[PDB]
């Protein structure tokens, strides 16, 4: 796992632990896991474009990784999709999983769509950031922002929910509203 050491106010990937004795780790407070959203990287934040990056698969257990520090998200998503017959499509959020804390917009996307897998993964391999946990799957009725987690060594509010009605979630023939 890559690590980040802030040398002279400049971040460098610590791929080798034998870098230099200049790097100091006095306490665990210097170690921090920052979860940065993908919106900063410039990816498309549109609902018809963001949902194409999410795919359903079966056989891969969900995994959750903790991150302490987060990034303010200007575009969050709240999937409440269900199967066309009314069956549940996304697993319920377990204890300790809450919505993303800071969200300028919460794209609450509801509707119907095919659910070919027990869990909804990210096609780009990124995580689904939550209140303080990063999960590889999407939980039902929980605000999340698709993002990535970085581990580094530190040196010594209103949400506007947007309603969507999606038919055919996860397919190239998808209609919104």
């Amino acid at each position, epitope marked *: 796992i890559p690590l980040g050491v802030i040398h002279n106010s400049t971040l460098q990937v610590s791929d080798v632990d034998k870098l230099v004795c200049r790097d100091k780790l006095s306490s665990t407070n210097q170690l921090r896991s920052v979860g940065l959203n993908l919106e900063g990287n410039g990816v498309a934040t549109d609902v018809p474009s963001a949902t194409k990056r999410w795919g359903f698969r079966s056989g891969v257990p969900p995994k959750v990784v903790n991150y302490e520090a987060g990034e303010w998200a200007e575009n969050c998503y709240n999937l409440e999709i269900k199967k066309p017959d009314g069956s549940e499509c996304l697993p319920a959020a377990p204890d300790g999983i809450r919505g993303f804390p800071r969200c300028r917009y919460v794209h609450k996307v509801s509707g119907t769509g095919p659910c070919a897998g027990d869990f909804a993964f990210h096609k780009e391999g990124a995580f689904f950031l939550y209140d303080r946990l990063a999960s590889t799957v999407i939980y039902r009725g929980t605000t999340f922002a698709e993002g990535v987690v970085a581990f580094l060594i530190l040196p010594q509010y209103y949400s506007t929910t947007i309603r969507y009605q999606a*038919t055919g979630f996860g397919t190239n023939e998808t209609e919104y509203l």
Partner: antibody
Amino acid sequence: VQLVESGGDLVQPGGSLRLSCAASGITLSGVWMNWVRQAPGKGLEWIGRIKSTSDGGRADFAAPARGRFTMSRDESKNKLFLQMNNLGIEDTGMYYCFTRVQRDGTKDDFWGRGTLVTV
Amino acid sequence: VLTQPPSVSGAPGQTVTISCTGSYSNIGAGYDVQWYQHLPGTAPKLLIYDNVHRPSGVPDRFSGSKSGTSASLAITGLQTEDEADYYCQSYDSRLRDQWVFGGGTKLTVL
């Protein structure tokens, strides 16, 4: 858990018909209710569906029932009313009222008796 | 819009397979395919509620399998009480997620 359908009397080709679906032991507002048309000598034809009150309270209909058919729900007596405006001769057959209710990973339809409609 | 054979037949001791051809949006889109046993004079009875999963209270003889864009229903150890129309039910990615039923296969016991 059972469902019963009411209505379906003989209707002239020009007119309107009302179909009432009632259930005991299951709340219609909490589950998605589907309507299917079973014409004589013809396969099953899904016509409409109403979502639960928890989700969007809107009804989806197929192409033949796009505008002619309208669905209303009365939560007081947990009855679902299907209004069939501008009826036609092709709208003949048994109309069923069923819902996909999933419990502990297993789902059942709980089909109703089904009312026959003659035009 | 998904199609079914007009009718099927098989010996009681043999296993009868009922075909159901869909498309990229009906079955190729990942929608679950359901099978119904429509006994005459009574409401249809669900037999398979997913690609392979079967509801409780349904005999183990009825088994289903989805391959590619088509789904097949297998009836092993056929009896004389299964002579009824079998319908293939799925959903379409097009038409804004509307249920699609098959043409119906009238299984006949010889």
